[PDB]
C-alpha cells in the first residue's frame, strides 16, 4: 500500500515541480499531498473509507488548452479527490498487470 | 492592513442585515433583549439570528403584554 | 459488399483517400478489385460494431 | 469488488462547471479522472472483443 | 396594464423516459 | 470660414464616370426590351438543364446499416446558430 | 490547512452576504469569511444553506420514486437528486438509511 | 370602391432560396432582369441568378450589415451603405470597390440614385442624410431637418425630387438644389419606415406601423389611407400595374390595389426549416423588371421569390 | 468622422444593436406615451444575452409577448453574429495566419 | 423506436413547411466566379 | 400670422384646420398632377447643373 501511495503521490507533486507561486487551491494541494507523505496510515484509510462510501462528489472545473488547431479538455478536481482517485489508479493498474487483465494486442504498452 | 477591512466589513455587513443590536461604551456589540456580549457583531447576530435569543423576546413580549 | 451496396458507375473511387505525401510511383494505384476489397473489407468491420456503441 | 465500481461510476457523474456555466453529465465518461485509463483501455478491451470476436 | 414592465432587476448587474427502466431491469 | 486642411484619402480619384456603354446594358436596350419573355425562356432552359441533369458465425449483430441513406440534414437550412449543421460540424471539429 | 467544519458564524454571514451581494460572485463573499475559499462557499449554498434546499422526513412517495430511480440508475445521484427534487447527499443518507432499516 | 375594382390575381410562393448566414436586409434588382443582390447583417453582398435562383457571386468588404444596396442604370455600379457608417461604390467592371463616401455620423439606413443627374443621396441614423456627387465624392448638401434616424428616403426627377421619412414620423420633401424642405407631412403617429413612389400617377405613399398613406405631387395633399395590417412595416413596393405590397416585421404580407385601398389577399409565409417563429418577417422586398415576380429578404435568412398565380380566376 | 475599425467593432456592433432595437420599437412597441421602459427594455436585451451566454433558459413571468418576440430575435441575432465571428477566427487561427493576444484568447473562451 | 442523438430531427423538412408549390432551393457558395465580369465590357 | 411671423409671406406654412382634411378623388388623372413635363425638367436640371 505505502508504495502505491508513494507513487502516485509523487506523480500528483510532478505536474507543479517548477513551482511559481501557484494559486491558493494549488496551495491546498501541495499543503494536502505534503501532508500525506508525513501520516501515510491515516491518508490510506481515509481514501478506503470515501471508496467504501461516498458516492457524491464536488463539481469539477473545465478549461481548454489550445493547440490552434484543436482544444484539448482539462478537468479540475479537488485535491482529496484527486489524492483518493490517484491511489485508486495505482492500484487499478497494479492488480490489473499481475493478473493479466489485458491481452497483448493494447498497446500503449508499459514494455515499448 | 487588510485584518483590519474585515472587521470593518463585518461590522457593516451586520449593520445592514439587522431593533436589538447595539454597542457598549467600549466597542462590544451586545443584545440588549438576553443581555448578551457578542465579540463580532456577526458572531454576536448569529445568538441574534438564534433560536434562543427569539424566544427571550417573545417571553419579555408576553411579560410586558401582561 | 457490392450485394448490400452496388456501384454500377465505379464511384468507389471518387472518395477513396491514399497517401498524397509520397511519390507517384509509391501512391496506391486505384482498381476495382483492390478499392472495392478495400470498403468491402471497411464495411464488415463497421457492422460488427453497433452505432449506438461506438462508430468508425 | 463492487464497491470500487460504484466509486469508479459515481465519479464520472459530476456537475461541470465553467464561470456561469454549470451542468450535469449523466452520459459521457470525464476523461481528466485519474482511473480513467483503466476504464478507457478495459471497455476498449470489450470492443475489441467485438471486433475480432471470441474464437479469434 | 398590459404595459406594466417588469423591472429587468439583474441577476448579473426535467424529465426522465422510461425505456431506462426496461434497459436497467434488462441488465 | 473654410479650413486649409486637407487628407490623404479626399484627393482625386477616379475622376472619370463609367458610362454603361451598348452591350453592357445601356438603358436603350432596357426601355424597348420585353423582360416577362425573356424570363420565361431563360427560366425554362434552366429547368431543361435540371432536368438533363437528373463466416464471423460469431457476432452481436446483424447488419445496422440497412436503410441509412444519410438523409437531408445537409440540405435542410436552418436558421438557428445553434442548430445549423454548420454549427453543429463547427462545434465537432475545433472541440476535441 | 483551509478546510474545516462549519460554523453558525460563517453561516449566517453566509446568508447575509449571499443575500447582498448575489448568488454569481463567489470570490467577493469567500473575502469576508476566514478559513474557507470560494468553491466551499458556493458548494456549501447549494449544497445545504439555500432556502430551496427541502429539509424534512420523506413522503411515502418519495421513498417509492427514491428506491425506484435508484434500481433504474444504480450509483448516480447527481441524475436522482434533481428528479425528486431534494439533495443529492441527503437522498444518499436517506437511501442507506432505508436499507439500514429495512434490515 | 368604385365599383368592386381591378380584379387581379393571387400571388403563389414560387421558390425559396437559402445561403445566407445573416438577416438579409435588402434586395435590388439589376436593369435587364439578370441578377438581383442581396445586402446581409452576414457582411456580404450576393449577387443571384433571377431565372435559375442560383448564387453567382459573393461580395466582401463591408465591416458591418449591409444595409442598403442600388444597382445603377446608367453606370455599371453597385453603391452599398452599412451599418458600419460607409458607402461604397463598387465597379461590377472589377467587382471592386473604386470610390467611398465619407462623412455621416452613424449607420446609414438607405440610399438612392438620381435617374437622370448622377448623385447619390442616403439616409442615416445621426437624422441627416446627404446628397452626394458620385463622380467626385462629395457631400453637395446636408439636409439637416428630422429629430431622429431617417429611415427611407426616395429619388425622383420632378418636383420634390427627394422624398424622406424618418423615425420622428414626420416626412420632409426636399428641394434639392436648395438642400431645405418644402413640404413637412406629420400625419403618421408612429415611426414612416417605407415609402413608395407610383411609376405613372404622380403620387407616393408612405407607410408607418398604425397605417399606410398615399399623398398627391407636389406638396403632399393626403389623398387616401389605406388601413388594414397592422405591424411595424418595412416595405412598401409597387407594380405598373398598380399593385401595392407591403411587408411587415411579424412575417405578414399584404397586396393592395394602389387606386382604393383594396387589399385583395393576405399573405403569412412559413419561417424557414431550422429558425424560430419569432425570426419572421420581411425586411424588404422588391419586383423584377417584367413585373412577373416578387422577391422577399427575410429575417430567417432566406430570399423567396412569389410568382403570379396563373389559374387565379 | 471616425472611422469603424478593428478597435471599435465589437462596440460598434453593440451600440447599433442597442440603437436598432431603441428606435424600432420605441417607434413599435409604444402608447407608454411617458417614457416606456427604454433603460428597462435594454436591460433585459442585456440579462438576455447574458442568459444565452449562460445557455440559462431566459423567461421573465411577466411580459408583452411583442416585446419577447423582440429580444428573442435581436437575441438570436447578436447570437449569430457572434458565433460566425468565432468559426471564421478559429479558421484564421489554424491556418495561422493572425498572430494576436487577445484574439486567441477570446476565441478559446468562445468555443 | 429510438433515434440517436447523432440524429434526431428538429424543424420539419424545408420543403414541407412551405409546401409544394414553391420551390425552395439552399444556394451556397455561388457560381461564375469572380473574375467574371456583371456587366461584360464592349469592345 | 402667429407662424409665419419669423419667415417671408413667400415661404408656406400649414395652420389652420383645413389644410389638415382630406380632399378626395381627382380621377384617373387631370392635368393637376402631372411631372412638369419633359421641357420643365431639361430647363431645372440644366440651371441646377
Ligand atoms: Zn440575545
Given at each position: ?91 487499478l ?20 | ?66 | ?56 | ?51 475480432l470476436?471470441?474464437?479469434? | ?27 | ?84 449543421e454548420f ?10 | 490547512i ?102 | 370602391t368604385?365599383?368592386?375594382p ?20 435588402c ?54 451603405c ?27 439606413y ?45 429619388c ?58 398615399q399623398?398627391?405631387?407636389?406638396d ?18 409597387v407594380?405598373?400595374?398598380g ?20 387589399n ?14 419569432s ?35 | ?43 433585459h ?46 479558421e ?20 | ?43 | ?41 431639361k ?7
Open positions: 500500500d505505502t508504495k502505491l501511495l508513494i507513487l502516485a503521490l509523487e506523480r500528483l507533486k510532478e505536474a507543479y515541480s517548477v513551482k511559481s507561486r501557484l494559486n491558493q487551491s494549488q496551495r491546498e494541494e501541495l499543503g494536502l499531498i505534503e501532508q500525506a507523505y508525513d501520516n501515510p496510515h491515516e491518508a490510506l484509510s481515509r481514501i478506503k473509507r470515501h471508496l467504501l462510501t461516498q458516492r457524491a462528489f464536488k463539481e469539477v472545473g473545465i478549461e481548454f488548452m489550445d493547440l490552434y488547431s484543436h482544444l484539448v479538455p482539462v478537468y479540475d478536481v479537488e485535491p482529496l479527490e484527486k489524492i483518493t482517485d490517484a491511489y485508486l489508479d495505482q492500484y493498474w497494479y492488480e490489473a498487470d499481475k493478473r493479466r487483465l489485458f491481452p497483448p494486442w493494447i498497446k500503449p504498452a508499459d514494455t515499448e | 492592513s487588510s485584518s483590519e477591512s474585515n472587521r470593518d466589513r463585518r461590522e457593516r455587513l451586520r449593520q445592514l442585515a439587522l431593533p436589538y443590536f447595539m454597542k457598549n461604551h467600549l466597542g462590544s456589540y451586545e443584545c440588549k433583549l438576553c443581555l448578551t456580549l457578542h465579540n463580532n457583531e456577526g458572531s454576536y447576530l448569529a445568538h441574534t439570528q438564534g433560536k434562543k435569543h427569539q424566544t427571550n423576546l417573545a417571553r419579555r413580549a408576553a411579560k410586558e403584554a401582561k | 459488399y457490392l450485394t448490400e451496396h452496388p456501384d454500377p458507375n465505379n464511384e468507389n473511387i471518387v472518395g477513396y483517400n491514399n497517401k498524397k505525401c509520397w511519390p507517384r510511383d509509391a501512391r496506391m494505384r486505384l482498381m476495382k478489385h483492390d478499392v472495392n476489397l478495400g470498403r468491402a473489407v471497411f464495411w464488415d468491420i463497421k457492422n460488427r460494431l453497433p452505432r449506438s456503441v461506438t462508430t468508425v | 469488488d463492487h464497491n470500487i465500481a460504484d466509486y469508479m461510476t459515481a465519479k464520472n457523474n459530476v456537475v461541470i462547471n465553467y464561470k456561469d456555466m454549470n451542468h450535469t453529465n449523466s452520459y459521457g465518461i470525464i476523461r481528466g479522472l485519474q482511473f480513467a485509463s483503466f476504464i478507457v483501455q478495459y471497455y476498449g478491451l470489450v470492443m475489441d472483443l467485438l471486433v470476436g471470441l474464437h479469434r | 396594464q398590459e404595459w406594466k414592465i417588469p423591472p429587468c432587476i439583474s441577476n448579473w448587474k426535467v424529465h426522465i423516459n422510461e425505456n431506462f427502466a426496461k434497459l436497467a431491469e434488462a441488465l | 470660414q473654410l479650413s486649409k486642411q486637407y487628407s490623404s484619402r479626399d484627393l482625386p480619384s477616379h475622376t472619370k464616370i463609367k458610362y454603361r456603354q451598348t452591350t453592357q446594358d445601356a438603358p436603350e436596350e432596357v426601355r424597348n426590351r420585353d423582360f416577362r419573355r425573356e424570363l420565361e425562356e431563360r427560366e425554362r432552359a434552366a429547368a431543361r438543364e435540371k432536368n438533363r441533369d437528373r463466416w464471423d458465425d460469431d457476432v452481436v449483430f446483424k447488419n445496422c446499416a440497412k436503410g441509412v441513406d444519410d438523409q437531408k440534414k445537409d440540405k435542410r437550412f436552418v436558421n438557428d446558430t445553434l442548430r445549423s454549427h453543429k460540424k463547427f462545434m465537432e471539429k475545433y472541440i476535441k | 483551509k478546510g474545516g467544519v462549519w460554523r453558525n458564524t460563517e453561516d449566517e454571514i453566509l446568508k447575509a452576504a449571499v443575500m447582498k451581494y448575489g448568488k454569481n460572485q463567489w470570490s467577493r463573499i469567500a473575502s469576508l469569511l476566514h478559513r474557507k475559499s470560494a468553491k466551499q462557499c458556493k458548494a456549501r449554498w447549494y449544497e445545504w444553506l439555500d432556502p430551496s434546499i427541502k429539509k424534512t422526513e420523506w413522503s411515502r412517495e418519495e421513498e417509492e420514486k427514491l428506491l425506484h430511480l435508484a434500481k433504474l440508475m444504480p450509483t448516480q445521484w447527481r441524475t436522482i437528486a434533481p428528479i425528486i427534487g431534494r439533495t443529492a447527499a441527503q437522498c444518499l443518507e436517506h437511501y442507506e438509511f432505508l436499507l439500514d432499516k429495512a434490515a | 368604385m365599383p368592386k381591378q380584379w387581379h390575381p393571387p400571388w403563389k410562393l414560387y421558390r425559396v432560396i437559402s445561403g445566407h448566414l445573416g438577416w438579409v436586409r434586395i435590388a434588382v439589376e436593369p435587364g432582369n439578370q441578377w438581383f443582390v442581396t445586402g446581409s447583417a452576414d457582411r456580404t453582398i450576393k449577387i443571384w441568378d433571377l431565372a435559375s435562383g442560383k448564387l453567382k457571386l459573393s461580395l466582401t468588404g463591408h465591416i458591418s450589415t449591409v444595409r442598403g444596396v442600388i444597382v445603377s442604370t446608367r453606370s455599371p455600379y453597385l453603391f452599398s452599412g451599418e458600419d457608417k460607409q458607402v461604397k461604390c463598387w465597379d461590377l467592371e472589377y467587382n471592386k470597390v473604386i470610390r467611398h463616401y465619407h462623412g455621416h455620423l452613424s449607420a446609414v438607405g440610399l438612392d440614385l438620381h435617374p437622370t443627374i448622377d448623385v447619390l443621396v442616403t439616409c442615416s441614423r445621426d437624422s441627416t442624410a446627404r446628397i452626394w456627387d458620385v463622380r467626385t465624392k462629395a457631400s453637395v448638401h446636408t439636409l439637416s431637418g428630422h429629430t431622429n434616424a431617417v429611415a427611407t428616403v426616395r425622383q426627377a420632378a418636383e420634390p425630387q427627394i422624398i424622406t421619412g424618418s423615425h420622428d414620423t414626420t416626412i420632409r420633401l426636399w428641394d434639392l438644389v436648395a438642400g431645405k424642405t418644402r413640404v413637412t407631412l406629420t400625419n403618421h403617429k408612429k415611426s414612416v419606415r417605407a415609402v413608395v413612389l407610383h411609376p405613372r400617377h404622380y403620387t407616393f405613399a408612405s407607410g408607418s406601423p398604425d397605417n399606410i398613406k399623398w398627391k405631387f407636389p403632399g395633399s393626403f389623398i387616401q389611407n389605406l388601413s388594414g395590417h397592422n405591424a411595424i412595416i418595412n416595405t412598401l413596393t407594380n405598373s400595374d399593385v401595392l405590397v407591403s411587408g411587415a416585421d411579424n412575417g405578414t404580407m399584404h397586396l393592395w390595389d394602389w387606386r382604393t385601398g383594396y385583395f389577399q393576405r399573405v403569412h409565409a412559413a419561417v424557414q426549416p431550422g429558425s424560430l417563429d425570426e419572421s418577417g420581411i425586411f424588404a422586398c422588391a419586383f423584377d423588371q417584367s413585373e412577373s415576380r416578387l422577391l422577399t429578404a427575410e429575417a430567417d435568412k432566406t430570399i423567396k421569390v412569389y410568382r403570379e398565380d396563373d389559374t387565379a380566376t | 468622422a471616425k472611422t469603424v475599425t478593428k478597435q471599435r467593432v465589437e462596440s460598434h456592433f453593440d451600440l447599433e444593436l442597442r440603437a436598432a432595437v431603441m428606435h424600432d420599437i420605441l417607434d413599435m412597441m409604444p402608447e407608454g406615451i411617458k417614457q416606456n421602459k427604454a433603460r428597462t427594455i435594454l436591460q436585451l442585456s440579462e438576455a444575452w447574458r442568459c444565452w451566454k449562460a445557455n440559462i433558459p431566459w423567461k421573465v413571468p411577466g411580459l408583452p409577448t411583442p416585446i419577447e418576440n423582440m429580444i428573442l430575435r435581436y437575441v438570436k441575432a447578436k447570437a449569430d453574429w457572434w458565433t460566425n465571428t468565432a468559426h471564421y477566427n478559429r484564421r487561427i489554424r491556418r495561422g495566419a493572425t498572430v494576436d493576444k487577445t484574439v486567441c484568447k477570446k476565441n478559446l473562451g468562445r468555443l | 423506436e429510438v433515434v440517436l442523438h447523432e440524429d434526431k430531427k428538429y424543424y420539419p423538412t424545408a420543403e414541407e413547411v412551405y409546401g409544394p408549390e414553391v420551390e425552395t432551393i439552399v444556394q451556397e457558395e455561388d457560381t461564375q466566379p469572380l473574375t467574371e465580369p456583371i456587366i461584360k465590357p464592349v469592345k | 400670422a402667429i407662424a409665419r411671423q419669423g419667415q417671408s409671406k413667400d415661404k408656406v406654412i400649414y395652420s389652420k384646420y383645413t389644410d389638415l382634411v382630406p380632399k378626395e378623388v381627382m380621377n384617373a388623372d387631370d392635368p393637376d398632377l402631372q411631372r412638369p413635363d419633359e421641357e420643365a425638367i430647363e431645372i436640371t440644366e440651371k441646377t447643373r
